[PDB]
Each structure stands twice: as structure tokens, then as C-alpha cells.
């Protein structure tokens, strides 16, 4: 599923991400834009042998088990396939676990390089929320 910008903003707000760990809703929508282009099925392979999955590109070395990544920790305790659903619940629940640590949203590299420090509220403007 490819979410529309405001559609995703509404879903993320409903999933309790607005101000989660102090990160405004715009941060999360901007993250999804640059991590997955709002595509719930997005998957990207990394040269370190891991693979990123879903709307928020959660990593197979630390967060989910895909059975093909050496050094797997599966901290969210889920199969990486769970992160590829049209339903963002699993991705949100795992993202909440990830962001709760001190590094916060810096875990998301595309967010770090494209969203962090920018006018992220722009990502939710024009949306009925």
C-alpha cells in the first residue's frame, strides 16, 4: 500500500506517534516519506548484510528477524514480514520501542539526513487531523 501524505499523518496520529518521545507528528511523516516513500512494502538491502523493511524501514540486524541476517537480535520480537503489512500497527509498535532509547529518531538514517532539524511541521499542513 502506498499511503497519501495526509492519510498517513492521520494514521500515525491515531497510532499515538504525535509527540511520542517528544517527536512531533511531522517528524514521523517526514521519516516515512524519505525512508519508504510512504510504501508499506518498501524493502532495501544494505551492504552490511541487513535489510530494512516497511513504512519505517526497520532493520533486520537489530529489530526484526528475517532469517537471513547474521548477528540478528530481533529486539522487537517479530518476523520482518510483519513490517510489510498495509496495517502499520506492527511497524509503529516496533518504532516506539526503537525511539524510546536515547538516540531517539536518529535510528532512522533517511530521517536524520532529510528531516532532522528541518521544518517538519510542513509535512502535516493541509491535513485534516
Amino acid at each position, epitope marked *: 500500500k502506498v499511503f497519501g501524505r495526509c492519510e498517513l499523518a492521520a494514521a500515525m496520529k491515531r497510532h499515538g506517534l504525535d509527540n511520542y518521545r517528544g517527536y512531533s507528528l511531522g517528524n514521523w511523516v517526514c521519516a516515512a516519506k*524519505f525512508e519508504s516513500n510512504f510504501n508499506t512494502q518498501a524493502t*532495501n*538491502r544494505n*551492504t*552490511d548484510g541487513s535489510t530494512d523493511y516497511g513504512i519505517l*524501514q526497520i532493520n533486520s540486524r537489530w529489530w526484526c528477524n528475517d532469517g537471513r541476517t547474521p548477528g540478528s537480535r530481533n529486539l522487537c520480537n517479530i518476523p520482518c514480514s510483519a513490517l510489510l503489512s498495509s496495517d502499520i500497527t506492527a511497524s509503529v509498535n516496533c518504532a516506539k520501542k526503537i525511539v524510546s532509547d536515547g538516540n531517539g529518531m536518529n535510528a532512522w538514517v533517511a530521517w536524520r539526513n532529510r528531516c532532522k532539524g528541518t521544518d517538519v511541521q510542513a509535512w502535516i499542513r493541509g491535513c485534516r487531523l
Partner: nanobody, 124 residues
């Protein structure tokens, strides 16, 4: 940062082509290099990337057929495309981007320097 690309063109299915990409402007070799392609009517897809350690990652659609290599000290990368298929037809773009503790991936948004690209057309 500047990118110079070469190679590409027309070829019959089952054949091969080699693309090259030379980068200039970086202060060190701590960056990512990769190829992204845009098939007609589709969005750009990352197909092969390589880090400063020579490690690689590929899109499932090209694994085994495409091989990316990089002469790190020369800031140059190559894409050896063997056993081409019609579905491989597209504008191919070399791109350079931010590495993350030496790792590189196929997400186009993490690449901030792009070039003119090169057309690759595979006839059946």
C-alpha cells in the same frame, strides 16, 4: 562533488553492457556509490550499491546478473550487467550518498549527488 558516467546503449537480450561512474569532490572515501534505474512509467529503483569496504547489495531483480565493483582509491565504480533482459531497459543513474558507519543501502533518498544518467535499451 561531480559525477561522470559512461557506457550504456542498445543490446540484444542475453547480452551484456558495462557502465562506469567516476566521482570527484569528496574529501575522503567515506561515502556510498550505487546505480538507480527508472523504467518507463516507473519510479527509480536502486539496483546495486557498494560501500568503501567493497561490500555490495542488490535488488532481487538483478542479483547474480549485475555486479557492482569499486576502485575505492580511484573514486570510481563499475556496473557489469550480464544476461540482460528486456525488463532491464531504463535510464540508469549513478549516485553518491552518505554512508552510515560504513554501510550503504538501496534507498535513493540517501543519495544526494546524481548525474545525467545513461540509457540502456535491451531488445528482445
Amino acid at each position: 562533488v561531480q559525477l561522470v558516467e559512461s557506457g550504456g546503449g542498445s543490446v540484444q537480450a542475453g547480452g551484456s553492457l558495462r557502465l562506469s561512474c567516476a566521482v570527484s569532490g569528496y574529501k575522503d572515501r567515506n561515502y556510498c556509490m550505487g546505480w538507480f534505474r527508472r523504467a518507463p512509467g516507473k519510479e527509480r529503483e536502486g539496483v546495486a550499491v557498494i560501500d568503501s569496504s567493497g561490500r555490495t547489495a542488490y535488488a532481487d531483480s538483478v542479483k547474480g546478473r549485475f555486479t557492482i565493483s569499486r576502485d575505492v582509491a580511484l573514486d570510481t565504480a563499475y556496473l557489469q550487467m550480464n544476461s540482460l533482459k528486456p525488463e532491464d531497459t531504463a535510464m540508469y543513474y549513478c549516485a553518491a550518498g552518505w554512508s552510515s558507519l560504513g554501510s550503504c543501502g538501496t534507498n535513493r533518498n540517501r543519495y544526494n549527488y546524481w548525474g545525467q544518467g545513461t540509457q540502456v535499451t535491451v531488445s528482445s
